[PDB]
Design an enzyme around this catalytic site. Structure first.
Site, PDB file in Angstrom:
ATOM      1  N   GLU A   1       0.783  -1.247   0.000  1.00 24.62           N
ATOM      2  CA  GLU A   1       0.000   0.000   0.000  1.00 24.62           C
ATOM      3  C   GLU A   1       0.804   1.281   0.000  1.00 24.62           C
ATOM      4  O   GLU A   1       1.868   1.344   0.607  1.00 24.62           O
ATOM      5  CB  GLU A   1      -0.875  -0.036   1.214  1.00 24.62           C
ATOM      6  CG  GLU A   1      -1.791  -1.223   1.229  1.00 24.62           C
ATOM      7  CD  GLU A   1      -2.701  -1.263   2.449  1.00 24.62           C
ATOM      8  OE1 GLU A   1      -2.712  -0.263   3.199  1.00 24.62           O
ATOM      9  OE2 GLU A   1      -3.433  -2.278   2.606  1.00 24.62           O
TER      10      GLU A   1
ATOM     11  N   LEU B   1     -12.130  -6.524   5.110  1.00 26.84           N
ATOM     12  CA  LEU B   1     -12.122  -7.715   5.987  1.00 26.84           C
ATOM     13  C   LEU B   1     -12.937  -8.811   5.325  1.00 26.84           C
ATOM     14  O   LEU B   1     -13.849  -8.525   4.537  1.00 26.84           O
ATOM     15  CB  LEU B   1     -12.752  -7.341   7.339  1.00 26.84           C
ATOM     16  CG  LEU B   1     -11.834  -6.418   8.165  1.00 26.84           C
ATOM     17  CD1 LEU B   1     -12.546  -5.881   9.412  1.00 26.84           C
ATOM     18  CD2 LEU B   1     -10.527  -7.142   8.542  1.00 26.84           C
TER      19      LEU B   1
END
Length: 496
Positions: free
Chosen positions: A187, A385
């Site tokens: 990221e 998630l």
């Protein structure tokens, strides 16, 4: 008026599934070929457009500098293609796993890590002097420390080798997206909330700019602003699991709002934007003139978004506060490279988070998607998630088409794709998978699965200065969002 029943194809959002971690293992072998072939068949038969996989630097270039072995990844890609699926490949210049939980451990190449034993400042460093070994600090992007190469050159040479060794998959349209890894976990951010140094949700995180390279840069910057003695944040910033009001730096009217604070936060966030700019510039040079998207991944830091300080955003490197849009400048940098923004948290609802976290994933997603669209880039995303329930799927459907379907043409607001985390045993379980297939049908606007290419990647546009980029920090209203999706997984229509 439109003809009843006709759904324009521009409504379709592609749906990709992330492959299990270690599908190619740390010895550069592709095991369980039959099992994987089977999963791929199920995914395809469920209607998915493709799959995403990490292309691990510590697998490919493991034996030494420019010794690249693409064999096992070619076998995998050939198999994916044969099962009728497109490929999103991540150039993963970071570590996979390494904790007691984790079923796979792939560090960056050992010949890099050996350099780190004698020079620990090649790693992002917190103020206590902890080194994160998962990724090379942006401070070494242009330092010629790695057997005669700089970090940027290593990234470039790896991507060139990938292109040249996957030329046939690239020509055939089998590889559709290159996600360029820009930090730990792939990221574009600082590793401000590391589990390995004891962070737990919803800690504010810590600044990650204490390596000697970033420090020399800082010392130079503050001298030129006319404040030689301004230091990086000290004890006032608190530690990973503080809350903002327990600190001096992040409390209301704290240090973050002082001239020294603003100067530090600008410098810190600008170094992250420059790093992205330099990494994506190398990607654009490699892939220009091919029909492939190039993407950077920005993580969704939704905790303390509703606090004045936005403290977890700030420690991650996104200088996003009232009156300062910290995402739009990233999107504008991305636009220069004709790159896509991949964002996360598309499934999350504010009511799912504890109130004490001051968490606002819904408003964060709305800000980031809006700011990317206003810079004329595509925005794709992922669930943060694992989720198998209808509430989650309906929130992702809302985010991919925030003003629902358009019967007169392509929607006003549409994400360019969603990648689902992740292919697993739980997902393929009969009940979950049934729900998942309805989600995919809704992603497709109830069309049938529909195979053509990304645009030809244009050459990066001319450079603009740091200051011209800061014009993009001006706050603006986000586009209005609907409160519910148009196309819920139960098949109803909330507008009738």
């Amino acid at each position: 008026a439109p003809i009843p029943g006709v759904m324009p194809i521009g409504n379709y959002v592609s749906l990709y599934v992330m492959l299990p971690l270690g599908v190619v293992n740390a010895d550069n072998v592709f095991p369980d070929k039959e099992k994987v072939e089977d999963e791929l068949k199920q995914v395809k038969a469920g209607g998915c457009d493709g799959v995403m996989v990490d292309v691990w630097w510590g697998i490919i270039e493991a034996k030494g500098p420019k010794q690249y072995d693409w064999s096992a990844y070619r076998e995998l890609f050939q198999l994916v293609k044969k099962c009728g699926l497109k490929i999103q490949a991540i150039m993963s210049f970071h570590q996979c796993g390494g904790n007691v939980g984790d079923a796979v451990f792939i560090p960056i190449p050992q010949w890099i890590l050996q350099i780190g034993d004698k020079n620990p400042d090649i790693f992002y460093t917190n103020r206590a002097g902890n080194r994160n070994q998962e990724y090379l600090s942006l401070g070494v992007d242009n330092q010629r420390l790695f057997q005669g190469r700089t970090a940027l050159e290593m990234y470039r040479d790896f991507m060139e080798s990938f292109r040249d060794n996957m030329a046939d998959f690239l020509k055939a349209g089998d590889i559709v997206d290159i996600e360029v890894g820009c930090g730990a976990a792939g990221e574009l951010r600082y590793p401000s909330y590391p589990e390995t140094q004891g962070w737990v949700f919803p800690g504010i995180g810590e600044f990650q700019c204490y390596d000697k390279y970033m420090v020399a840069d800082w010392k130079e910057a503050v001298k030129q602003a006319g404040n030689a003695d301004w230091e990086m944040p000290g004890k006032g910033a608190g530690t990973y699991n503080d809350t903002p009001d327990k600190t001096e730096f992040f409390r209301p009217n704290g240090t973050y709002k002082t001239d020294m604070g603003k100067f530090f936060l600008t410098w810190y966030s600008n170094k992250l934007i420059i790093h992205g700019d330099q990494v994506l510039e190398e990607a654009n040079k490699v892939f220009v003139g091919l029909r492939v998207n190039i993407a950077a991944k920005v993580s969704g830091i939704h905790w303390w978004y509703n606090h004045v300080s936005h403290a977890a955003e700030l420690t991650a490197g996104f200088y996003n506060v009232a009156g300062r849009d910290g995402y739009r400048p990233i999107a504008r940098m991305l636009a220069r490279h004709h790159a896509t923004l991949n964002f996360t948290c598309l499934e999350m609802r504010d009511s799912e988070q504890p109130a004490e976290a001051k968490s606002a994933p819904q408003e964060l997603v709305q800000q980031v998607l809006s700011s990317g669209w206003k810079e004329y880039i595509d925005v794709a995303g992922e669930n943060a998630l694992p989720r198998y329930d209808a509430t989650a799927y309906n929130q992702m459907l809302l985010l991919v088409r925030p003003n629902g379907v358009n019967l007169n043409g392509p929607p006003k607001l549409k994400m360019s794709g969603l990648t689902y985390l992740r292919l697993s045993d739980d997902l393929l379980q009969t009940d979950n998978f049934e729900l998942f297939k309805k989600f995919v049908k809704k992603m497709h606007a109830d069309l049938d699965p529909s195979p053509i290419s990304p645009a030809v990647l244009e050459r990066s546009n001319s450079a603009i200065t740091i200051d011209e980029l800061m014009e993009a920090t001006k706050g603006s209203r986000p586009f209005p969002w609907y409160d519910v999706t148009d196309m819920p997984v139960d098949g109803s229509n909330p507008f009738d």
